[PDB]
Amino acid sequence: SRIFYLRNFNNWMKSVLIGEFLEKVRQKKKRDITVLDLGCGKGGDLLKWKKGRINKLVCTDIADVSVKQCQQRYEDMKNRRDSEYIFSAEFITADSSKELLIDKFRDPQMCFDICSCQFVCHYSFESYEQADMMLRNACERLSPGGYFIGTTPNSFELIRRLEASETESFGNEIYTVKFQKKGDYPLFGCKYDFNLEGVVDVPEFLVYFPLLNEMAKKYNMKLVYKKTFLEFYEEKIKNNENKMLLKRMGLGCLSKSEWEATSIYLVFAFEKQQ
Ligand SMILES: Nc1ncnc2c1ncn2[C@@H]1O[C@H](CSCC[C@H](N)C(=O)O)[C@@H](O)[C@H]1O
Numbered sequence: 001s002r003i004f005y006l007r008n009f010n011n012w013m014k015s016v017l018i019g020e021f022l023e024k025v026r027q028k029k030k031r032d033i034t035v036l037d038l039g040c041g042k043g044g045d046l047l048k049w050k051k052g053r054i055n056k057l058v059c060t061d062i063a064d065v066s067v068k069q070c071q072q073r074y075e076d077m078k079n080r081r082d083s084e085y086i087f088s089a090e091f092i093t094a095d096s097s098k099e100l101l102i103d104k105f106r107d108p109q110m111c112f113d114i115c116s117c118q119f120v121c122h123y124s125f126e127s128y129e130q131a132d133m134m135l136r137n138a139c140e141r142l143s144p145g146g147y148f149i150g151t152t153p154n155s156f157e158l159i160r161r162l163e164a165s166e167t168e169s170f171g172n173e174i175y176t177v178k179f180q181k182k183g184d185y186p187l188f189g190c191k192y193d194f195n196l197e198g199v200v201d202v203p204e205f206l207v208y209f210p211l212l213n214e215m216a217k218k219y220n221m222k223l224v225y226k227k228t229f230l231e232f233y234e235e236k237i238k239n240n241e242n243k244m245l246l247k248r249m250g251l252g253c254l255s256k257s258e259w260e261a262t263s264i265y266l267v268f269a270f271e272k273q274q
């Protein structure tokens, strides 16, 4: 199928997002960029961190199999290079919705300039304590001026499509979202099935972004911006560095169906206050 159209477009989205806030970090900390990749998966963003020229990376995921794949991909990157430097990394298996990551870090008092949480944080909204815990994990160890960036389904788009659907499901040939019931969107535990054909079929939880925003305040976070994937793309392609990067990473235009899948998402970035 066309899995890698969406995969690579989404990776271009993450690269533009990561690149933007790495540049904002580097405008101050050219010294020792430290990044928490929360829900790193199998390490899809390792290369972006390598190109970002960061110094330390904590890769953590709930799936141990994915963390070890992340570790292996990292060691493969490290084991050969045109380059001479590459960030150091630690790899932590953990439910960042239930466990304190500082309990696992090599260095507990370490601080991050960026916590990147790409397509992960909505799993934290099973419950308030889990949503709070993931925020704490993403944000508590952020240095003042550090960034909490991520991508997560846009609850408005999900709900809008749900209310517009004649059923509790919606989607196309590429993806299906099924809510358990309609009109019942609890702050937490609002579960729905997300099926991305050939990619993932996993239950997710509605993240009402104003709720995520309010909750980030508890960790001295302020929203830098929230952008739908449409807003973000339409804005970011205007910069032709981003455009060319999309031509190099992408496999061609997204299909209407792919864009329908991708458009459920939003990009967000918060900054740790002084
Ligand atoms: N509670 C939790 N804590 C840590 N990671 C979680 C999690 N719930 C889900 N995940 C992870 O979130 C990831 C979602 S897929 C996104 C992976 C990666 N960030 C990327 O952009 O490619 C998966 O790897 C999954 O294992």
Ligand SMILES: O=C(Cc1ccsc1)N1CCC[C@H](c2[nH]nc3ncccc23)C1
Pocket: 006, 007, 010, 011, 041, 044, 119, 196, 199, 200, 202
């Ligand atoms: O583009 C991405 C990142 C990506 C794409 C292909 S592999 C990583 N997205 C959007 C759709 C779902 C992805 C997702 N969520 N949960 C997952 N679990 C397992 C595997 C994938 C998972 C996140």
